[PDB]
């Protein structure tokens with residue numbers, strides 16, 4: 697989605713590992729549906745990002761790339777998601 | 780290893796998911812070696828526990844079972860490990 701670094705670059709270098717396959721029940725990429733009821737649950741594109749940073753269960757905290765700015769985490773959420 | 784609940788119970792209900800297979804490069808169960816150079820690196824059985832709680836990379840924080848006392852986390856470390 698957006699742009700810090702990518703999400704193209706970010707999904708592929710960090711996010712890939714679970715979201716690609718669906719490993720651990722990771723909401724898979726392009727799966728507009730799954731991601732939707734999610735935003736729903738946490739009030740938009742900020743409930744996923746505020747969510748990734750914190751982490752949830754088996755989803756490791758901060759998406760990962762403990763390097764990432766907040767803008768990148770959202771761009772890789774933007775593009776795992778659809779929106 | 781030790782006893783809060785188990786680690787038998789704990790490894791099997793929470794820890795299983797990655798350490799069983801080796802999913803995500805999770806140091807597998809019984810693998811005395813792998814776990815050893817680990818304790819080494821973080822000064823004993825407290826560098827894994829202080830470690831799990833915090834989490835590291837793809838290892839989700841607090842082993843998981845965000846329920847667990849510290850004594851259980853160590854007993855499931857005791858028994859993933861060998862020691």
Ligand code: HEM
Pocket residue numbers: 706707710711712713714715719720721722723734738743744745747748752753754755756758759760761769770772773803837
């Ligand atoms: C890459 C930095 C990355 C981001 C960003 C990210 C985000 C993310 C969101 C927003 C969710 C939904 C959380 C919610 O419902 O609020 C989510 C869910 C899971 N993720 Fe993730 N995720 C990124 C990458 C990774 C990686 C590399 C892993 C595997 C170690 C992983 C795993 C998961 C899992 C599992 C879930 C579902 C967890 C659950 O909802 O029970 N993600 N992720």
Ligand code: HEM
Pocket residue numbers: 720754789790793794795796797798802803804805806817821826827828830831835836837838839841842843844852853855856
């Ligand atoms: C169950 C509550 C559980 C515990 C406890 C636990 C501990 C643990 C330790 C001590 C390490 C070594 C960390 C270090 O080197 O200091 C470790 C490593 C990894 N784990 Fe784990 N772990 C438990 C369970 C789980 C589960 C359910 C997952 C999968 C979502 C998982 C994953 C991993 C991974 C991956 C690693 C290696 C991470 C890395 O060292 O790069 N663990 N765990």
